[PDB]
Structures are given as structure tokens and as C-alpha cells.
Amino acid sequence: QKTLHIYNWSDYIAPDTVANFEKETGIKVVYDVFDSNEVLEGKLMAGSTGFDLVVPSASFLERQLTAGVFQPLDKSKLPEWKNLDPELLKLVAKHDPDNKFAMPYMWATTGIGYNVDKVKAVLGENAPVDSWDLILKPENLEKLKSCGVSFLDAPEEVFATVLNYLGKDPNSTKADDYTGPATDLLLKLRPNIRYFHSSQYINDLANGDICVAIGWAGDVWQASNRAKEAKNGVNVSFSIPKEGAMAFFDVFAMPADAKNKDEAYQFLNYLLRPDVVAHISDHVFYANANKAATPLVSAEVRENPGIYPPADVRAKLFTLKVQDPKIDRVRTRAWTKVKSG
Ligand SMILES: COCCOC[C@@H](C)OC[C@@H](C)N
């Protein structure tokens, strides 16, 4: 009886995906979850992860490749790879040349989640919910503190977002952009932020304990759906702001020391089935990377422009680039200053 160890983001699979896979294959799955690319990167760089499959964002996977922590995927063992959208593959290939190591899973944007009724109560019916001004303008964040503000604990994403908002290159390579204007704005906003966290904001939005957050798109749409099913009167929405936003592509990868690679390939092939991955999108409110799966995705998810955004919105999205050690050091130091103080 072989097993399979999977490490994925929290709130990123359907409730029955693993159980259905177990029943069909007789494999027992050990499934654990994270909410931080930094936590996963640290595990991969410090020693064995103990997992057969892990799911980093592609921009982090680029750095992980330089350490040799993944096994190149045997495409002969992934017959339905063709189901993957070739345009998303090409974007991920910027981080993973010729798509040797990573299987695109889901993708979304880093935008603004908010409580519709509370934001209009505080900022009025003309609140700029289509703009990063809603939370990155100090005058606005000071008022929204009344009902709670959270930021992702995602340093590379938050700094890229702030740099873009400031009219800088989102992937600026000038240290002074981080230590000066980016830090200046974040510290002006810092007094109004209740916490930095990358998963507690989902239920807090759903229960009405925070009213605005920097959040991941599908996470916020999950919060909205949780509130509706609870019939608690909380109306949550998500915005991809007009100034653009970061896009991310989360990918399955196979640690080089994975014990049960054959079982791992069986699970990747299971995910490449259009019906399996469309069912996941239906429950987690994320766009998958499977072009063959799109007709099976529920209308509610597939037609949500905050999940599958239209071309004019996609044209304003940016992606993270890997920085050299100098900028990495300055960004991390600045992040700690922003959070603590
Ligand atoms: C659904 O297929 C299109 C996939 O586009 C992904 C978006 C983020 O890229 C467009 C920008 C990044 N150049």
C-alpha cells in the first residue's frame, strides 16, 4: 500500500478531490496545507520537504530551480499535458524554461476584497472600489479602519503592488524605491492595518469582522460564497483595480527526493482531466490552467470577470520577476520594518 504526500495552498482544492482519487487508485493521500510562498521556499531550501508534490507560485519556483530542488517532469507520463492552456504555459515558461518542471494548476490576481455594504457606509456610494486608492490612499484607509483592514503577509506581492501604484516599475531594481517611497507609503498606511495575514482574512471577510483586504481573488470569492450560504447578510466583493494588479500562476512541482513519484504522476494526470480540475474551480472560485476544462466550469465562476478577467483587464496585469541578492536583501529588511513598527 503506497501513499502520496501533497503540500498545497489552503482553500485550494474541492472537498472530495482527494477522496475520489483515493477510491479510484487505492492510493492513500497525506494532504497538508500552507498559506505562504516563503514558508514553502524555506522548507525546500532547508532540507527534505517530506512531500511528493508541492505547489509554489511560478515566480518562486524560478528561484527554487536554481537550487535544484525539483525533478524534471517525465512528459511521457503526462499524456494529457496538451489540455493545458498554451498561453499560460508560455507565461510560466518565463520562470520554467520549456515547461520542464512545473504543471500549471490555478491562477488569479492580487486585488482588493471588501464588504460592499460597509465600504459604502464609510466612503459613500461613489467609493473608488475600482482603484487601489481605496486602500493605498491614507485618507481612505483611515476611515476604513472603523471596520477592519488586512494586508497579505506576502512581501514580494505587496511591494510590487505599492511600486506599481506609485508609478514605479513593479519589479524595480533600484533599492531606493523600496527604502524610500514604497516604505514611506506603507508606513503612512501601517497605523490603519489591523494585521498582516494571508488566510485569516477569508473567514473575517465572510463573517464581517474586516471590511477591506489585500487578498487573492479566489480567496475573496470563497469568502463571498461562504457569507451567502451562511445567510448572514454579508455582501463581499472583489476588485481588480484600474491601475493594474499582480497576476500569479500556482504550479505543481515534484521535489527531487520525492519517495512516491509514480503515485505523484498518477495524481497530476488526475488533475489534467478536464472534469476533475473544473470541479475544483467550481468550489474554490479560481481559474484553472486547463483549456479543455473551461466548458465544464460553472457559469458562476467562468463568467466572473474577477476570476476569468477579460482581455482589457489582463493587459494591465504584471508578474513578479526574481531579484538579485542586493534587492532581495533590501526588500526583506524593509518588509520587516513595515510590519513591526
Ligand atoms: C486565459 O488566457 C490568457 C492568460 O493570460 C494571463 C494574463 C495574466 O497574462 C496577460 C499579461 C500578463 N500579459
Give the Å distance between the CA of 233 and the centre of ligand 1.
34
Residue 307's contacts (CB-CB under 8 Å, 6 or more residues apart) are 108, 217, 218, 221, 285, 286, 287, 301
Output the CA angle 313-97-312, nearest 5 degrees.
10
Give dist(CA 84, CA 82) in Å, integer: 5
Give the Å distances, CA to CA, from 279 to 4, 211, 275. Answer: 21, 29, 6
Together in a domain, 91 and 126:
no
| Residue 237 assigned ligand-binding role | no
Output the CA angle 67-161-217, nearest 5 degrees.
85
Q: Which three cell numbers stand for residue 41?
A: 521556499
Give dist(CA 306, CA 224) in Å, integer: 12
Give the Å distance between the CA of 30 and the centre of ligand 1.
33
Closest by CA to 315, choosing from 261, 264, 240, is 240
Atom index in ligand 1 nearest the CA of residue 308 equals: 1
Number of helical H runs and strand E runs in the chain: 17, 11
Together in a domain, 224 and 143:
yes
Together in a domain, 1 and 144:
no
Do 3 and 264 form a contact (C-beta atoms < 8 A)? Answer: no
Type of residue numbered 54? V
Do 304 and 296 form a contact (C-beta atoms < 8 A)? Answer: no
Together in a domain, 155 and 232:
yes
Do 89 and 290 form a contact (C-beta atoms < 8 A)? Answer: no
Grid cell 527534505 is found at 48
Give dist(CA 57, CA 247) in Å, integer: 10
Atom index in ligand 1 nearest the CA of residue 85 equals: 2
Give dist(CA 74, CA 131) in Å, integer: 44
Do 116 and 122 form a contact (C-beta atoms < 8 A)? Answer: no
Q: Which three cell numbers stand for residue 271?
A: 488533475
Sign of CA dihedral 132, 134, 140, 146: negative
Give dist(CA 41, CA 338) in Å, integer: 22
For atom 13 of ligand 1, the residue with the nearest CA is 315
| Residue 219 assigned ligand-binding role | yes
Give dist(CA 327, CA 333) in Å, integer: 10
Give the Å distance between the CA of 315 and the centre of ligand 1.
7
Give the Å distance between the CA of 12 and the centre of ligand 1.
20
| Residue 153 assigned ligand-binding role | no
Experimental method for this entry?
X-ray
Give dist(CA 75, CA 95) in Å, integer: 18
Together in a domain, 168 and 313:
yes
Together in a domain, 152 and 212:
yes
Q: Establish whether residue 85 lines the binding site of ligand 1, counting it when its CB lies within 6 angstroms of any ligand atom.
A: yes
Do 278 and 271 form a contact (C-beta atoms < 8 A)? Answer: no
CB atoms near residue 172 (< 10 Å): 21
Grid cell 499560460 is found at 88
Together in a domain, 239 and 117:
yes
Do 114 and 242 form a contact (C-beta atoms < 8 A)? Answer: no
Q: Establish whether residue 293 lines the binding site of ligand 1, counting it when its CB lies within 6 angstroms of any ligand atom.
A: no
Together in a domain, 160 and 144:
yes
Can you give the residue range of the structural domain that contains 322? 108-248+309-341
Together in a domain, 227 and 263:
no
Give the Å distances, CA to CA, from 183 to 22, 41, 160, 324, 326. Answer: 48, 24, 12, 19, 17
Total domain count, the chain: 2
Together in a domain, 115 and 133:
yes
Together in a domain, 329 and 211:
yes
Do 92 and 99 form a contact (C-beta atoms < 8 A)? Answer: yes
Tally the residues of the chain: 341
Give dist(CA 127, CA 139) in Å, integer: 12
Together in a domain, 72 and 121:
no
